[PDB]
Amino acid sequence: HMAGVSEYELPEDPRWELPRDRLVLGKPLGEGGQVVLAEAIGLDKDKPNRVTKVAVKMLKSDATEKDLSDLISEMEMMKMIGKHKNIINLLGACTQDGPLYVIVEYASKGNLREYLQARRPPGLEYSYNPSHNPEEQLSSKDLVSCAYQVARGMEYLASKKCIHRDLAARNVLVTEDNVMKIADFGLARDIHHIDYYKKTTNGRLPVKWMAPEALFDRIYTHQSDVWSFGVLLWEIFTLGGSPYPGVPVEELFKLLKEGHRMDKPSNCTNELYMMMRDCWHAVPSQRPTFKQLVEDLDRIVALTSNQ
């Protein structure tokens, strides 16, 4: 476990520091680290009487000293990377008079995976809609536009020397205005060899988004992120589909080595599928960059129908 919060010297930053009484705790948003919904009073000094819905990150009742440094690490990392419309930005923090709170932007519509699944057409082209409360079906343009925003955010993160290392639909959140925001891009990398078998609390296997070199040699770069983006693209056009269906984790090693790739999803243009194949190129140097991906997608968004 960890020592008292007072036992440690939390990084106090006047620009982001916010009084704890200015935060009105709400319902839990995520459990891993712990996130909860909250209402901040006067986040913007220019308007101290305005309330704003935000997400509050805090450690668990059972946290290690490393967990505290990791959280701080992400906070300072977000400051470094800066702000961008397509990423979950830092809003403030509480480093005094209580536990450490890292305030970030709130995405009312949850992660992209569940977002899409809830908007699956009754048709046959997709799996059955899991959501008990279906939503309006997205247009063809909406999906490509969704890919554009994600690639847009990654392009920015790439220009900031930031390597996500786990880009996936689950790691992309949707705002109330349907804006795509990449999350968990400032997390600290573990210094202990990974367990390709470990599964997330959501029952997700990170190995399915990892590039061959990142999976076999544990090498992470912007190129490996482009690979993940290729898998993310696959998820979009499958409306929250599961990568490599019916393929065991252990089998994934051989298959990927064989140069095998996922088949084009139903209702997916060949141009968009070729983009996925280019991202899934065997040679890192041959995969396209986020800069290019943003350009092609922009061109595609303008051509793609919205009806």
From Swiss-Prot:
What changing residue 196 to F does, per the record, is: No effect on kinase activity. Loss of autophosphorylation and kinase activity
Provide the effect of residue 235 to G: In HH2; phenotype consistent with Kallmann syndrome; the patient also carries a rare variant in DUSP6
Q: Where is the active site?
A: 166 (proton acceptor)
Look up what happens after changing residue 57 to A: Loss of kinase activity
Q: Look up what happens after changing residue 209 to R.
A: In HH2; with cleft palate
For the modification Phosphotyrosine, the affected residues are 8, 126, 128, 196-197, 273
Annotated tissue distribution: Detected in astrocytoma, neuroblastoma and adrenal cortex cell lines. Some isoforms are detected in foreskin fibroblast cell lines, however isoform 17, isoform 18 and isoform 19 are not detected in these cells.
Upon changing residue 15 to L, the result is:
In HH2; some patients also carry GNRHR mutations
What processing steps or modifications follow its translation?
A: Autophosphorylated. Binding of FGF family members together with heparan sulfate proteoglycan or heparin promotes receptor dimerization and autophosphorylation on tyrosine residues. Autophosphorylation occurs in trans between the two FGFR molecules present in the dimer and proceeds in a highly ordered manner. Initial autophosphorylation at Tyr-196 increases the kinase activity by a factor of 50 to 100. Ubiquitinated. FGFR1 is rapidly ubiquitinated by NEDD4 after autophosphorylation, leading to internalization and lysosomal degradation. CBL is recruited to activated FGFR1 via FRS2 and GRB2, and mediates ubiquitination and subsequent degradation of FGFR1.
Instruction: Say which domain of life the source belongs to.
Output: Eukaryota
Q: What does this protein do?
A: Tyrosine-protein kinase that acts as a cell-surface receptor for fibroblast growth factors and plays an essential role in the regulation of embryonic development, cell proliferation, differentiation and migration. Required for normal mesoderm patterning and correct axial organization during embryonic development, normal skeletogenesis and normal development of the gonadotropin-releasing hormone (GnRH) neuronal system. Phosphorylates PLCG1, FRS2, GAB1 and SHB. Ligand binding leads to the activation of several signaling cascades.
Q: Assembly and interactions?
A: Monomer. Homodimer after ligand binding. Interacts predominantly with FGF1 and FGF2, but can also interact with FGF3, FGF4, FGF5, FGF6, FGF8, FGF10, FGF19, FGF21, FGF22 and FGF23 (in vitro). Ligand specificity is determined by tissue-specific expression of isoforms, and differences in the third Ig-like domain are crucial for ligand specificity. Affinity for fibroblast growth factors (FGFs) is increased by heparan sulfate glycosaminoglycans that function as coreceptors. Likewise, KLB increases the affinity for FGF19, FGF21 and FGF23.
The protein's name is: Fibroblast growth factor receptor 1
